[PDB]
Protein backbone atom coordinates (compact mmCIF):
# COMPACT_ATOMS: atom_id res chain seq x y z
CA UNK A 1 0.00 0.00 0.00
CA UNK A 2 2.94 2.34 0.63
CA UNK A 3 5.00 1.28 -2.39
CA UNK A 4 2.17 1.27 -4.94
CA UNK A 5 2.22 5.10 -5.15
CA UNK A 6 5.84 5.33 -6.37
CA UNK A 7 7.39 5.33 -9.83
CA UNK A 8 10.85 3.87 -9.34
CA UNK A 9 13.64 4.27 -11.90
CA UNK A 10 16.56 1.86 -11.39
CA UNK A 11 19.77 1.95 -13.42
CA UNK A 12 22.19 -0.90 -12.67
CA UNK A 13 25.71 -0.91 -14.15
CA UNK A 14 28.51 -3.53 -14.30
CA UNK A 15 26.40 -6.37 -12.89
CA UNK A 16 27.97 -9.83 -12.56
CA UNK A 17 26.36 -13.19 -13.52
CA UNK A 18 23.08 -11.73 -14.81
CA UNK A 19 20.91 -14.84 -14.95
CA UNK A 20 17.58 -14.58 -16.75
CA UNK A 21 14.51 -16.82 -17.01
CA UNK A 22 13.90 -16.04 -20.69
CA UNK A 23 15.62 -15.25 -23.96
CA UNK A 24 14.00 -11.79 -23.80
CA UNK A 25 15.81 -11.27 -20.42
CA UNK A 26 12.94 -9.40 -18.77
CA UNK A 27 13.37 -10.89 -15.28
CA UNK A 28 16.71 -11.03 -13.44
CA UNK A 29 16.67 -14.35 -11.59
CA UNK A 30 20.21 -13.99 -10.22
CA UNK A 31 20.41 -14.81 -6.48
CA UNK A 32 19.85 -12.04 -3.96
CA UNK A 33 23.25 -12.48 -2.29
CA UNK A 34 25.16 -11.59 -5.47
CA UNK A 35 22.88 -8.63 -6.24
CA UNK A 36 22.94 -7.44 -2.61
CA UNK A 37 26.74 -7.54 -2.77
CA UNK A 38 26.77 -5.80 -6.17
CA UNK A 39 24.15 -3.11 -5.50
CA UNK A 40 25.63 -0.58 -3.06
CA UNK A 41 22.54 1.62 -2.96
CA UNK A 42 22.00 3.37 0.38
CA UNK A 43 18.22 3.09 0.74
CA UNK A 44 18.28 4.65 4.23
CA UNK A 45 19.08 8.12 2.87
CA UNK A 46 16.41 7.72 0.17
CA UNK A 47 13.96 6.87 2.96
CA UNK A 48 15.16 10.00 4.80
CA UNK A 49 14.78 12.08 1.63
CA UNK A 50 11.19 10.94 1.06
CA UNK A 51 10.72 11.44 4.81
CA UNK A 52 11.71 15.09 4.37
CA UNK A 53 9.61 15.33 1.19
CA UNK A 54 5.96 16.29 1.63
CA UNK A 55 3.90 15.92 -1.57
CA UNK A 56 4.73 12.22 -1.85
CA UNK A 57 3.97 11.53 1.83
CA UNK A 58 0.58 13.31 1.88
CA UNK A 59 -1.05 10.99 -0.75
CA UNK A 60 0.34 8.09 1.34
CA UNK A 61 -1.30 9.54 4.49
CA UNK A 62 -4.65 10.30 2.81
CA UNK A 63 -4.86 6.91 1.05
CA UNK A 64 -3.74 5.21 4.27
CA UNK A 65 -6.40 6.89 6.42
CA UNK A 66 -9.06 6.10 3.82
CA UNK A 67 -7.74 2.51 3.80
CA UNK A 68 -8.13 2.32 7.60
CA UNK A 69 -11.66 3.72 7.24
CA UNK A 70 -12.43 0.95 4.74
CA UNK A 71 -10.67 -1.57 7.00
CA UNK A 72 -12.37 -0.96 10.35
CA UNK A 73 -15.63 0.18 8.74
CA UNK A 74 -16.49 -3.27 7.31
CA UNK A 75 -15.93 -5.67 10.21
CA UNK A 76 -17.63 -7.28 13.26
CA UNK A 77 -20.53 -9.73 13.71
CA UNK A 78 -23.99 -9.91 15.40
CA UNK A 79 -25.40 -7.02 13.34
CA UNK A 80 -28.89 -7.15 14.85
CA UNK A 81 -29.26 -3.47 15.77
CA UNK A 82 -32.70 -3.01 17.32
CA UNK A 83 -31.55 -2.32 20.90
CA UNK A 84 -27.87 -1.47 21.38
CA UNK A 85 -28.58 -1.03 25.09
CA UNK A 86 -31.48 -2.88 26.69
CA UNK A 87 -33.76 -0.06 27.92
CA UNK A 88 -31.61 2.60 29.64
CA UNK A 89 -28.85 2.14 32.25
CA UNK A 90 -31.06 4.18 34.61
CA UNK A 91 -34.20 2.25 33.62
CA UNK A 92 -35.75 -0.38 35.89
CA UNK A 93 -36.84 -3.16 33.54
CA UNK A 94 -39.88 -5.07 34.82
CA UNK A 95 -39.90 -8.86 34.73
CA UNK A 96 -43.18 -9.06 32.78
CA UNK A 97 -42.27 -6.10 30.58
CA UNK A 98 -43.03 -6.58 26.90
CA UNK A 99 -45.89 -9.05 27.43
CA UNK A 100 -49.57 -8.71 28.29
CA UNK A 101 -49.98 -7.81 31.98
CA UNK A 102 -50.59 -4.72 34.11
CA UNK A 103 -46.98 -3.69 33.63
CA UNK A 104 -46.51 -0.15 34.94
CA UNK A 105 -43.67 2.29 34.17
CA UNK A 106 -42.57 4.98 36.65
CA UNK A 107 -41.36 8.27 35.16
CA UNK A 108 -39.74 9.86 38.20
CA UNK A 109 -37.67 13.05 38.11
CA UNK A 110 -34.01 13.02 39.11
CA UNK A 111 -31.66 10.05 39.39
CA UNK A 112 -31.16 10.73 43.12
CA UNK A 113 -34.71 9.43 43.53
CA UNK A 114 -33.44 5.99 42.27
CA UNK A 115 -32.95 4.98 45.93
CA UNK A 116 -35.69 2.64 47.22
CA UNK A 117 -37.45 2.49 43.80
CA UNK A 118 -36.18 -1.04 43.11
CA UNK A 119 -36.70 -2.26 46.68
CA UNK A 120 -40.48 -2.12 47.28
CA UNK A 121 -41.84 -1.98 43.75
CA UNK A 122 -43.53 -4.91 42.09
CA UNK A 123 -40.64 -6.75 40.45
CA UNK A 124 -42.89 -8.29 37.79
CA UNK A 125 -45.31 -5.41 37.14
CA UNK A 126 -43.76 -2.13 38.33
CA UNK A 127 -40.87 -0.61 36.42
CA UNK A 128 -39.12 2.74 36.52
CA UNK A 129 -37.01 5.36 34.77
CA UNK A 130 -35.87 8.74 36.16
CA UNK A 131 -36.24 11.80 33.95
CA UNK A 132 -33.76 14.69 33.81
CA UNK A 133 -34.44 18.32 34.68
CA UNK A 134 -37.17 20.08 32.71
CA UNK A 135 -38.93 19.25 29.44
CA UNK A 136 -38.72 20.78 25.94
CA UNK A 137 -41.45 22.64 24.07
CA UNK A 138 -42.91 19.54 22.40
CA UNK A 139 -46.13 21.27 21.27
CA UNK A 140 -46.68 21.36 17.50
CA UNK A 141 -43.07 20.52 16.69
CA UNK A 142 -41.72 18.51 13.75
CA UNK A 143 -40.98 14.84 14.44
CA UNK A 144 -37.41 15.00 13.11
CA UNK A 145 -36.44 17.81 15.49
CA UNK A 146 -38.03 16.23 18.55
CA UNK A 147 -36.33 12.93 17.67
CA UNK A 148 -32.83 14.41 17.93
CA UNK A 149 -32.96 14.74 21.74
CA UNK A 150 -32.13 11.52 23.57
CA UNK A 151 -34.25 11.91 26.71
CA UNK A 152 -37.60 12.08 24.87
CA UNK A 153 -36.54 9.51 22.21
CA UNK A 154 -35.63 6.83 24.81
CA UNK A 155 -39.25 7.07 26.12
CA UNK A 156 -40.38 6.21 22.54
CA UNK A 157 -37.56 3.60 22.40
CA UNK A 158 -37.88 1.65 25.71
CA UNK A 159 -41.50 1.32 24.54
CA UNK A 160 -42.53 0.57 20.95
CA UNK A 161 -44.47 3.84 20.53
CA UNK A 162 -43.62 5.70 17.32
CA UNK A 163 -44.64 9.35 16.78
CA UNK A 164 -46.26 8.72 13.39
CA UNK A 165 -48.77 6.02 14.38
CA UNK A 166 -50.86 4.72 17.28
CA UNK A 167 -49.79 2.61 20.27
CA UNK A 168 -50.27 -1.16 19.95
CA UNK A 169 -46.98 -2.71 21.13
CA UNK A 170 -46.62 -1.32 24.66
CA UNK A 171 -43.73 -2.87 26.57
CA UNK A 172 -45.17 -1.17 29.67
CA UNK A 173 -48.96 -1.38 29.84
CA UNK A 174 -49.76 1.49 32.20
CA UNK A 175 -47.73 4.69 32.34
CA UNK A 176 -47.56 6.04 35.87
CA UNK A 177 -46.19 9.57 35.83
CA UNK A 178 -45.04 10.99 39.15
CA UNK A 179 -43.68 14.51 39.33
CA UNK A 180 -42.10 16.55 42.09
CA UNK A 181 -44.61 17.71 44.73
CA UNK A 182 -43.42 21.35 44.73
CA UNK A 183 -44.10 24.02 42.13
Amino acid sequence: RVKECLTIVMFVRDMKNMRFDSQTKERLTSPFGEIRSHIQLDAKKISRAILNNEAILMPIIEAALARKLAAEKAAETKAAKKASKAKVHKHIKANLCGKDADTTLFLTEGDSAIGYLIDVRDKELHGGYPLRGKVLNSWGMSYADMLKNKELFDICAITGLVLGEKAENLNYHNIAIMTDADH
Partner: protein, 62 residues
Amino acid sequence: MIKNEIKILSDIEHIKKRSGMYIGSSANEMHERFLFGKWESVQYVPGLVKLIDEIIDNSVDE
Protein backbone atom coordinates in the same frame (compact mmCIF):
# COMPACT_ATOMS: atom_id res chain seq x y z
CA MET B 1 -7.02 -39.97 -33.54
CA ILE B 2 -4.28 -37.35 -33.23
CA LYS B 3 -1.21 -38.19 -35.34
CA ASN B 4 1.85 -38.36 -33.06
CA GLU B 5 5.04 -39.02 -35.05
CA ILE B 6 8.33 -38.12 -33.39
CA LYS B 7 10.12 -35.71 -35.73
CA ILE B 8 13.62 -34.43 -35.00
CA LEU B 9 14.51 -30.92 -36.17
CA SER B 10 17.66 -28.89 -36.75
CA ASP B 11 18.35 -25.50 -35.12
CA ILE B 12 16.73 -23.33 -37.82
CA GLU B 13 13.55 -25.41 -38.21
CA HIS B 14 13.04 -25.68 -34.44
CA ILE B 15 13.44 -21.91 -34.09
CA LYS B 16 11.09 -21.20 -37.02
CA LYS B 17 8.45 -23.65 -35.78
CA ARG B 18 8.74 -22.59 -32.10
CA SER B 19 9.44 -18.85 -32.42
CA GLY B 20 7.62 -18.03 -29.16
CA MET B 21 10.40 -18.97 -26.74
CA TYR B 22 13.05 -17.31 -28.95
CA ILE B 23 11.65 -13.86 -29.78
CA GLY B 24 9.08 -13.67 -27.01
CA SER B 25 5.69 -12.27 -27.93
CA SER B 26 4.96 -12.40 -31.66
CA ALA B 27 1.41 -11.00 -31.52
CA ASN B 28 0.13 -7.42 -31.54
CA GLU B 29 -0.77 -6.60 -27.94
CA MET B 30 -1.48 -3.66 -25.65
CA HIS B 31 0.71 -2.81 -22.65
CA GLU B 32 1.51 0.26 -20.56
CA ARG B 33 5.01 1.52 -21.33
CA PHE B 34 7.15 4.46 -20.24
CA LEU B 35 7.78 6.30 -23.49
CA PHE B 36 9.70 9.60 -23.01
CA GLY B 37 8.98 9.41 -19.28
CA LYS B 38 5.23 8.95 -19.84
CA TRP B 39 3.28 5.88 -18.68
CA GLU B 40 1.23 5.56 -21.86
CA SER B 41 -0.85 2.66 -23.16
CA VAL B 42 0.95 1.36 -26.25
CA GLN B 43 0.02 -1.44 -28.66
CA TYR B 44 2.70 -3.14 -30.74
CA VAL B 45 4.54 -6.41 -31.41
CA PRO B 46 7.40 -7.02 -28.92
CA GLY B 47 9.15 -9.40 -31.33
CA LEU B 48 10.28 -6.65 -33.71
CA VAL B 49 11.34 -4.41 -30.80
CA LYS B 50 13.33 -7.34 -29.37
CA LEU B 51 14.68 -8.01 -32.89
CA ILE B 52 16.14 -4.50 -33.04
CA ASP B 53 17.28 -4.70 -29.39
CA GLU B 54 19.37 -7.85 -30.02
CA ILE B 55 21.57 -5.88 -32.46
CA ILE B 56 21.44 -2.80 -30.18
CA ASP B 57 22.57 -4.79 -27.12
CA ASN B 58 25.23 -6.53 -29.24
CA SER B 59 26.64 -3.11 -30.19
CA VAL B 60 26.53 -1.90 -26.57
CA ASP B 61 28.23 -5.17 -25.51
CA GLU B 62 30.92 -4.48 -28.13
